[PDB]
Amino acid sequence: GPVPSRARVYTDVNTHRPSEYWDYESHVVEWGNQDDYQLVRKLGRGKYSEVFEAINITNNEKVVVKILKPVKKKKIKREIKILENLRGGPNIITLADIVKDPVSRTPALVFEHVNNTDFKQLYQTLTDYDIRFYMYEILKALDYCHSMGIMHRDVKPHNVMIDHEHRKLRLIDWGLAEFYHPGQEYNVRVASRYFKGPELLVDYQMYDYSLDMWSLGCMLASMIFRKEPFFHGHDNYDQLVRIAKVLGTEDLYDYIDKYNIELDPRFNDILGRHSRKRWERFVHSENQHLVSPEALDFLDKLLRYDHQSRLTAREAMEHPYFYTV
Amino acid sequence: SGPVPSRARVYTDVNTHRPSEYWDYESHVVEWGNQDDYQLVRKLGRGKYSEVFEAINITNNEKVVVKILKPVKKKKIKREIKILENLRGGPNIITLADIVKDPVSRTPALVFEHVNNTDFYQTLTDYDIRFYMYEILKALDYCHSMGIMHRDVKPHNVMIDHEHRKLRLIDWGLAEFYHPGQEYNVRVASRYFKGPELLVDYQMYDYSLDMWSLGCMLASMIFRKEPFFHGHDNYDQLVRIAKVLGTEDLYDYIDKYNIELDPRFNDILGRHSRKRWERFVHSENQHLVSPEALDFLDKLLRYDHQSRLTAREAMEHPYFYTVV
Ligand SMILES: Clc1cc(CNCCc2nc3ccccc3[nH]2)ccc1-c1ccccc1
Ligand SMILES: Clc1cc(CNCCc2nc3ccccc3[nH]2)ccc1-c1ccccc1
Q: Does B217 sit in the ligand 2 pocket, CB within 6 Å?
C-alpha cells in the first residue's frame, strides 16, 4: 500500500494532550437562546450555511450569525470544538456564542463582527507591501492553528475576511477543519477545487498541516500574478492536470513513486506529458509591480508536489519576502 | 374583586410572541422510536409516575439514562416531551436523546444523555456551593428565557457528576409554559420547596416560584439543615416559613395581592417574629456561611414573588464574584 508520512512540525501536539481536547464526538455543546440576537440582513450563503449580520440586543453590538443546515451533527460538533479551542488565537474568527432559535431549533454560531472589503475591489488597489502584510497575517493564523494541532483544510480567498481600512484579517469557515493525529488517514474530499493539494487529487490520505501551505501558495500565486484562480481545473481530475502543466509530469511521478501511490485510471487519457515551467513566465505588464525575486522564491517553496518539502508556516514567516513587514 | 393579578418581571411575553407550535403541547405530534436499540442495565430511581434506569445504546455502546413513564395522563407526557424538545441542548438542562416505546409493553420512555451521579454535602466547600448554585442559575435563566417554569426545583432534581464538575437540572414532568395572567395549579413542587404563593393558593404565579425553591436548597446547603423548612403537610409548611420570615411580612404579602387565607390556617399560624439569618449559623456550618451568602439568601427567600431576585439578577450577586 502507500508509504506512511507525518508532519515535520507539531507532529505529536494532540498525542500529548488529553482526549477532551481533540475528541469532538464527546464534546457537550451548550446552545443558548437566540432571542438575545436580532437578525439584520443576509451577508452570504454556503452549501450548508447562511450568514447574517445581527445585533446583540443586550449590549447593542453588531455580530455575525452563521445559521447551519444540520446535515451532519458530528461535523457541527467538530467545528464548534475547533472554534472553542482556537477562540482568541491570532487572526482566527472569534466564536462569541452558540445559540438556537426557540421555534426552529436550527444550530447557529455567533461571531465577532468583521467589516469585510470586496475581493475584486481590493485586487486592483493592493500594493506589493499589502500582499506581504496580509500573507504574514494568514501565516500567523496558520502557525497558531497548526501549533494547536488543527489543519484548516479549506484555505482560499473566500475564507479570509479583511477590513482593509483597519488592516484587520480573520481566517474563517472552520467547518472543514480537523485535528491532526500522526498516521491518521483523512477524507480527501476537502477544501475547494482550485486550492486542493496534489495529495488530495491523487487520493493520498495521510496528509497534514502542509495541505494548508499548498492552498496558501495557490492564493499567493493568484495575488502576485493577477490570475484568479491560478490552477483553474474544471473537475477534480482536471485540477491535477492544471498543476502538472506548471510543475511538470516528471515530478508528479517522482512524488507518486516516493509514496507508492496508485494513480486512478481516470488520469490515463488526460494527464499527458508536461515540462516544468519557470515562475518568471507568469510575469506580465499588469502584474510586474507585485512580483519580485523574493516573491517567486517564496512561491516556489510553497507550490511543491511533495507535501514534506513545502515550507511550514513558521519557516515561511522567516522568509526574505517578509523582511519588510 | 378577588386576588390582584400579577405577571413576571422578566421574560413576561416570550411565549405570547412565539407561534402556537412552540407552546401548544396538546397539538404536538410525538414520534416514538423502537426501544430495542437500548438495553436496560439497572434501576437508578423511582418516582410517583416514573422509573429511571441506566441503559446501554447497543448501536454505539454508549451509556444512556432511560425514564419509563406510567401513562397516567397523556397530556402531561406530551407537555414534558415538548418542553424537553424546546430546551434540548440548553446549558445544564438534561438532554433528551430519543423518545421510544418498547414494542410489547408500548410504555412511553424518554432517553437522555448519561449523567454519572456522585453520592455526596459533608465534603462540599464554600466554593463548591457557589459554583454549583451558579450552574443551576444558568439552567434557570435559560429555561425562564424559553418561557418555561420548572416548578420542581429540589436536590433530587439536580444531578451532579462531582469528578467532572458537571450539573444537570432534570425531571421536567411538572414544568409548564409561562403565559402572563394564566392561573396555574398550585399542586406542584415538593412540600419543602413549595413557594408561599402555592401554599396560600395564589394561582397567578411565575418563574419566581423556581427562585424560592432555589433559596430553599441554598439555605439547606449553607446551614446543613435538610430540609430547611420542614413542614409535615402543606398548611404546616407555611407555618415553618412564617417561623423564620415572620407573620408581619406574610400579612403584607397576602394584603398586597388581596389573597384570602384558608381558614385551616386560623388555629396553626400563630404570631412569629422575623428571624435574623445569622441565627442559623452554628459550629457545623460556619465555614459555608458569609455576609454575601446571607444577603443573597435574604433576596431569594421573600414572601412576595415579585421582590425575589430573577435568575439573571441572582447571577450578578456578589456571592458569585469568585466563580467563572
Ligand atoms: Cl485572501 C483575501 C481575501 C479577500 C476578501 N475575501 C472575503 C470573502 C468573504 N466575504 C464574506 C462575507 C460573508 C461570508 C463569507 C465571506 N468571505 C481579499 C484579499 C485577500 C488577500 C489576502 C492576502 C493578500 C492579499 C489579498
Ligand atoms: Cl449537594 C447536592 C446534591 C445533589 C444530588 N441529588 C441527587 C440527584 C439524583 N436524582 C436522581 C434521579 C434518579 C436516580 C438518581 C438520582 N440522583 C443535588 C444538588 C446538590 C446541591 C444543592 C445546592 C447547591 C449545590 C449542590
A: yes
Are B134 and B237 in contact, with CB atoms under 8 Å apart?
A: no
Tell whether omega for the bond before B227 is within 30 degrees of 0, i.e. cis: yes
Residues 31-90 of B with CB under 8 A from A: 85-86, 88-90
Superfamily (CATH H level) for B6-23+115-324: Transferase(Phosphotransferase) domain 1 (1.10.510.10)
Other C-beta atoms lying within 10 Å of the C-beta of residue B236: 17
- Residue A79, burial from CB neighbour count under 10 angstroms (0-12, 13-18, 19+): buried
Neighbours of B307 (CB within 10 A): 12
A154 an active-site residue? Answer: yes
- Cβ contacts of B138 within 8 Å, gap of 6 or more: B91, B92, B315
Tell me the structure's resolution in angstroms, rounded to a single decimal: 1.8
Closest by Cβ to A33, choosing from B92, B113, B145: B145
> Can you tell me the distance from the alpha carbon of A78 to that of A308, in angstroms, rounded to the nearest whole number?
26
Question: Would you kindly state where each structural domain of chain B is located, as residue ranges?
Answer: 6-23+115-324, 24-114
Distance (angstroms) between ligand 1 centre and the Cα of A119 equals: 6
Q: Which of A143, A154, A208, A212 is catalytic?
A: A154
Q: Could you give phi then psi for residue A170, rounded to 5 degrees? A: -135, 135
Confirm whether B6-23+115-324 and B24-114 share one CATH topology: no
Using CB atoms, pick whichever of B19, B113, B145 lies closest to residue A103. Answer: B19
Rounded Cα–Cα distance for residues B318 and B296 (Å): 8
Cα–Cα distance measured from residue B212 to residue B170, given in angstroms and rounded to the nearest whole number:
18
Q: Looking at domain A23-113, what is its CATH homologous superfamily?
A: Phosphorylase Kinase; domain 1 (3.30.200.20)
CATH fold of the domain at A5-22+114-325: Transferase(Phosphotransferase); domain 1 (1.10.510)
Shortest CA distance from B85: residue in chain A = A105
Helix axes A249-258 and A236-247, enclosed angle (nearest 10): 110
Burial label, B75 (beta-carbon count in 10 A; 0-12, 13-18, 19+): exposed
Task: Indicate if ligand 1 lies below 6 Å from the C-beta of A229.
Answer: no
Length of chain B: 324
Measure CA of the first residue to CA of the last residue in chain A; give whole Å. 45
Q: Please give the C-alpha separations between residue B146 and each of A68, A163, B279, in angstroms, as whole numbers.
A: 21, 36, 38
* A180 ligand 1 Cβ < 6 A: no
Q: Would you call B145 and A31 a contact, using CB atoms and an 8 Å cutoff?
A: no
Closest CA to B294 of B324, B321, B319, B315: B319
Instruction: Decide: residue B131, CB within 10 A, 0-12 exposed, 13-18 middle, 19+ buried.
Output: middle
3-state secondary structure at position A84: helix
Q: B50 among the known binding-site residues?
A: yes
Q: Which residues of A touch B85 (CB under 8 A)?
A: 105
Query: Does the beta carbon of A113 lie inside 6 Å of ligand 1?
Result: no
Please tell me whether the peptide bond between A229 and the residue prior to it is cis, using omega within 30 degrees of 0. yes
Statement: B24-114 belongs to CATH 3.30.200.20:
yes
Contacts of B22 in chain A (CB under 8 A): 102-103
Contact B91 A29 (CB under 8 A): no
Q: Residues near A306 by Cβ (< 8 Å), separated by ≥ 6?
A: A255, A258
Give CA–CA dist A36/A54, Å, rounded. 10
Interface test with A, best of B13, B18, B61 (most A CBs within 10 A): B18
